[PDB]
Amino acid sequence: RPGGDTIFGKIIRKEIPAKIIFEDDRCLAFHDISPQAPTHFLVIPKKHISQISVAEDDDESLLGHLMIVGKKCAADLGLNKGYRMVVNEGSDGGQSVYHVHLHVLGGRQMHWPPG
Amino acid sequence: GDTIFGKIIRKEIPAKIIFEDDRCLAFHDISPQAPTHFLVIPKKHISQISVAEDDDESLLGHLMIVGKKCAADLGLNKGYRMVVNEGSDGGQSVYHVHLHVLGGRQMHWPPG
Ligand SMILES: Nc1nc2c(ncn2[C@@H]2O[C@H](COS(=O)(=O)NC(=O)CCc3c[nH]c4ccccc34)[C@@H](O)[C@H]2O)c2nccn12
């Protein structure tokens, strides 16, 4: 079982259903089950990294790829007034699932501060 | 940069710089929304994430790695939140790509 047994590791292996927007060899984009905006989806790596604080220097282009796929998917979903990308780390960040992920939120005016 | 962040990169106006290399700059935000609130920006003028190019991928990744290393250095051991805003709905305040890093308090949900 590559990808770990977080919920996200099981989504990667098609063991748990999700609404997938995009998939390649490096990552998977899918709609969030508790959306905080009219559009709210996640971009995750297939490589299991628990959290951004433990990402390796060599994980640089993978993290970049999450953001490139994020902005491409946002455009494909017609978020043409903009969006907010979020990564949460640890307890103060509110991280609930310990597999690195990028949130993309849009379809309404996002406020400041960002929580 | 024909933005204020351009002026910061060119060292034309003050900012409290945390880290610099050949391709990015990290500095404390002038209007902080947490006890720690800093930015990591590329030196290359990418106006917004929507127009980033495919071969900017390792650079964008570099911002996040530099951000997580600065976070650790600044003592954000209980965690943090990273944010990139795009466009008017996103609340993007400067048309030069920037990664926010906020910590030192509980960050809430939703994220704005
Ligand atoms: N599609 C789908 N999505 C799922 C499933 N399980 C979890 N998610 C999604 O993963 C995200 C984790 O982000 S995160 O920062 O780790 N977790 C958070 O929960 C951050 C937000 C948060 C919650 N309470 C807080 C309190 C303070 C600050 C932030 C928060 C959340 O937005 C979840 O809704 C699931 N199972 C089958 C299909 N599924």
UniProtKB/Swiss-Prot annotation, chain B:
CDD domains in the cross-refs: PKCI_related
PTM-bearing positions, type N6-acetyllysine: 7, 16
Annotated protein name in UniProt: Adenosine 5'-monophosphoramidase HINT1
The keyword Hydrolase appears for this protein: yes
Record-stated family: Belongs to the HINT family.
Protein's organism: Homo sapiens
Mutagenesis or variant effect for residue 30 to W: Approximately 30-fold increased affinity for tryptamine adenosine phosphoramidate
Keywords, comma-separated and alphabetical: Acetylation, Apoptosis, Cytoplasm, Disease variant, Hydrolase, Neuropathy, Nucleotide-binding, Nucleus, Phosphoprotein, Protease, Thiol protease, Transcription, Transcription regulation, Ubl conjugation pathway
Subunit structure: Homodimer. Interacts with CDK7. Interacts with RUVBL1 and RUVBL2 and is associated with the LEF1/TCF1-CTNNB1 complex and with a KAT5 histone acetyltransferase complex. Identified in a complex with MITF and CTNNB1. Interacts with CDC34 and RBX1, and is part of a SCF (SKP2-CUL1-F-box protein) E3 ubiquitin-protein ligase complex. Interacts with SUMO1, SUMO2 and RGS17. Interacts with the Ten-1 ICD form of TENM1. Interacts with CALM1; interaction increases in the presence of calcium ions.
Motif mapping: Histidine triad motif: 96-100
Molecular-function GO terms, alphabetical: adenosine 5'-monophosphoramidase activity; deSUMOylase activity; hydrolase activity; nucleotide binding; protein kinase C binding
Subcellular location: Cytoplasm; Nucleus
E.C. number(s) listed in UniProt: 3.9.1.-, 3.4.22.-
Function: Exhibits adenosine 5'-monophosphoramidase activity, hydrolyzing purine nucleotide phosphoramidates with a single phosphate group such as adenosine 5'monophosphoramidate (AMP-NH2) to yield AMP and NH2. Hydrolyzes adenosine 5'monophosphomorpholidate (AMP-morpholidate) and guanosine 5'monophosphomorpholidate (GMP-morpholidate). Hydrolyzes lysyl-AMP (AMP-N-epsilon-(N-alpha-acetyl lysine methyl ester)) generated by lysine tRNA ligase, as well as Met-AMP, His-AMP and Asp-AMP, lysyl-GMP (GMP-N-epsilon-(N-alpha-acetyl lysine methyl ester)) and AMP-N-alanine methyl ester.
GO biological process: intrinsic apoptotic signaling pathway by p53 class mediator; positive regulation of calcium-mediated signaling; protein desumoylation; proteolysis; purine ribonucleotide catabolic process; regulation of DNA-templated transcription; signal transduction
Impact after mutating residue 37 to A: No effect on affinity for 3-indolepropionic acyl-adenylate but a 13.8-fold increased affinity for tryptamine adenosine phosphoramidate monoester
Cross-referenced SUPFAM superfamilies: HIT-like (SSF54197)
Effect on the protein upon substituting residue 70 to R: In NMAN; negligible protein expression due to post-translational degradation; no effect on homodimerization; no effect on adenosine 5'-monophosphoramidase; no effect on affinity for tryptamine adenosine phosphoramidate; loss of SUMO-specific isopeptidase activity
Disease implication from the record: Neuromyotonia and axonal neuropathy, autosomal recessive: An autosomal recessive neurologic disorder characterized by onset in the first or second decade of a peripheral axonal neuropathy predominantly affecting motor more than sensory nerves. The axonal neuropathy is reminiscent of Charcot-Marie-Tooth disease type 2 and distal hereditary motor neuropathy. Individuals with NMAN also have delayed muscle relaxation and action myotonia associated with neuromyotonic discharges on needle EMG resulting from hyperexcitability of the peripheral nerves.
Catalytic activity field: adenosine 5'-phosphoramidate + H2O = AMP + NH4(+)
Residue numbers annotated as active site: 98
UniProt-reported outcome of changing residue 30 to F: Approximately 10-fold increased affinity for tryptamine adenosine phosphoramidate
Expression tissues: Widely expressed.
Regions annotated as coiled coil: none
Higher taxonomy: Eukaryota, Metazoa, Chordata, Craniata, Vertebrata
